[PDB]
């Protein structure tokens, strides 16, 4: 004959964001050089 | 065939590689592509593919790099572009 009455509650929870990513490329410039330190007739003696 | 490093983005040991590769397929190949190819190749194998290697007396480049595995040097007179992309 007793009914009683009650509350009840369920605790909350928390998310975070986050992020993924692959690898990464970067660009990159090369100019081959031309050196010529050659003389013209160097008279050797070998 | 000595070799100088200019440039690089890539691990001391990678480097490493990089040259005694190259100086393998020098001492090895004397046709430009066929030493290009030979440098190449190990490289996809050990650090997998894709890589893409220039070698050669005249020319400039720009190109796309994975981060860390890029490197250029000459070997004497020809220079040698090496990188990973794709």
Same mark, same amino acid.
């Given at each position: 004959?007793?009914?009683?009455?009650?509350?009840?509650?369920?605790?909350?929870?928390?998310?975070?964001?986050?992020?993924?990513?692959?690898?990464?490329?970067?660009?990159?410039?090369?100019?081959?050089?031309?050196?010529?330190?050659?003389?013209?007739?160097?008279?050797?003696?070998? | 065939?000595?070799?100088?490093?200019?440039?690089?983005?890539?691990?001391? @040991?990678?480097?490493?590689?990089?040259?005694?590769?190259?100086?393998?397929?020098? @001492?090895?190949?004397?046709?430009?592509?066929?030493?290009?190819?030979?440098?190449?190749? @190990?490289?996809?194998?050990?650090?997998?593919?894709?890589?893409?290697?220039?070698? +050669?007396?005249?020319? +400039?480049?720009?190109?796309?790099?994975?981060?860390?595995?890029?490197?250029?040097?000459?070997?004497?007179?020809?220079?040698?572009?090496?990188?990973?992309? +794709?």
């Amino acid at each position: 004959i007793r009914w009683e009455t009650k509350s009840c509650q369920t605790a909350s929870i928390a998310t975070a964001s986050a992020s993924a990513q692959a690898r990464n490329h970067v660009d990159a410039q090369v100019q081959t050089e031309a050196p010529v330190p050659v003389s013209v007739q160097p008279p050797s003696q070998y | 065939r000595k070799a100088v490093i200019k440039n690089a983005d890539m691990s001391e @040991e990678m480097q490493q590689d990089s040259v005694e590769c190259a100086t393998q397929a020098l @001492e090895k190949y004397n046709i430009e592509k066929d030493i290009a190819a030979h440098i190449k190749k @190990e490289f996809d194998k050990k650090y997998n593919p894709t890589w893409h290697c220039i070698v +050669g007396r005249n020319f +400039g480049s720009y190109v796309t790099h994975e981060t860390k595995h890029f490197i250029y040097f000459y070997l004497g007179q020809v220079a040698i572009l090496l990188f990973k992309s +794709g």
